[PDB]
Amino acid sequence: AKPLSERFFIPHEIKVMGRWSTEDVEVRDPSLKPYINLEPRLLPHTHGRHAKKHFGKANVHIVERLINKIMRSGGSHYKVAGHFMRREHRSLNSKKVKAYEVVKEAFKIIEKRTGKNPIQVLVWAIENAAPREDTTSVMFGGIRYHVAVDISPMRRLDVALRNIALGASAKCYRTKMSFAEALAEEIILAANKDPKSYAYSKKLEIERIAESSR
């Protein structure tokens, strides 16, 4: 099936998964620039040494962040697109090899369909899916009200990554699409500001509700 040149692939340079270089990738958003890490690195697996220290997740390569984000079940205690998604024994919890394979196949599909460097497309997606205004809640007279506030860049990045992963998770659930295809579809749609993307629609709704409560 898969050719032997792919089963036994050997790199010779420090580049992401030995296949794509990140030298020409640039970040437009001035706020997200010092939080998207793009230093050269061969293997995106750092064995969770960053969770101890405050702000330590800043210096973690963005591909590894995506891999960690999709390594989940998806819909445990809140509904996504109108449903709980409890996979349990058939989820991706603590299976980081399978997540690595999913991300690799998604990158190959992205490169085939659009002809561009997949890291660049991913950066565009997270730029378009990062909200700029959020809201907090107050209670009065037994009724709950919203008040608009601003968002720090780290939280923007976290929310964008989680929403992309959730959209991909919802698109392949009990349908003929596969996980890698859904992830590719979601990233491409978010990169083109298409409302059919879950992440972009979520960002629009969040910002609209925040605006209507200044």
Partner 1 sequence: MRIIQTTGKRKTAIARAVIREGKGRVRINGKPVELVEPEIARFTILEPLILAGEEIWNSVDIDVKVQGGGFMGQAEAARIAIARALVEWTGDMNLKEKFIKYDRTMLVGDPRRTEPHKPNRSTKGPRAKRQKSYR
Partner 2 sequence: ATVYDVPGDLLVERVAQRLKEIPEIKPPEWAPFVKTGRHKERLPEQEDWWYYRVASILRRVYLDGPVGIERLRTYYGGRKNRGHAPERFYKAGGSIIRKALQQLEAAGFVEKVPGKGRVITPKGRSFLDKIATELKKELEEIIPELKKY
Partner 3 sequence: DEGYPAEVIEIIGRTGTTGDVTQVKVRILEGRDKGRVIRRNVRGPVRVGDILILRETEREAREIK
Partner RNA sequence: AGUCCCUCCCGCUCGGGAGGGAGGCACUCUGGGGGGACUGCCGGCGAUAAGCCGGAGGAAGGGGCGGGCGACGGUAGGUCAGUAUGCCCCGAAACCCCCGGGCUACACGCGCGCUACAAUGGGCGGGACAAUGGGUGCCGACCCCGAAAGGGGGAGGUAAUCCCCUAAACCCGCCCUCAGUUCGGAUCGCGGGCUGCAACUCGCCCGCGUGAAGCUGGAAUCCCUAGUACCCGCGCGUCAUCAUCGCGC
Partner RNA sequence: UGGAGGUGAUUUAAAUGCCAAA
| Six token digits for residue 27 | 């970040």
Least distance in angstroms from the C-beta of 91 to partner 2: 17
Decide which of partner 2, partner 1, RNA, none touches 5; Cβ closer than 5 to 8 Å per partner kind: partner 2
Residues 3-42 that bind partner 2 (CB under 8 A): 4-5, 8, 10
For binding to partner 3 (CB under 8 A), which residues are involved? 29-31, 54-55, 132-134, 136-139, 149-156, 211, 214
- The answer to whether 21 and 107 are in contact (CB under 8 A) is no
177 φ/ψ angles, rounded to the nearest 5 degrees: -70, 150
The smaller minimum CB distance to partner 1, of residues 100 and 198, is found at: 100
d(CA 100, CA 148): 38
DSSP 180: H
Alpha-carbon distances, residue 25 vs 108, 117, 142, 145, 172 (angstroms): 17, 8, 50, 42, 29
SS3 205: helix
Q: Which residues bind partner 1 (CB under 8 A)?
A: 8-14, 18, 41-43, 45, 47, 49, 96-97, 100
Q: Which residues bind partner 2 (CB under 8 A)?
A: 4-5, 8, 10
Q: Which residues bind RNA (CB under 7 A)?
A: 1-2, 7, 47-48, 51-52, 70, 72-74, 77, 79, 83-95, 97-98, 101, 140-142, 169, 172-179
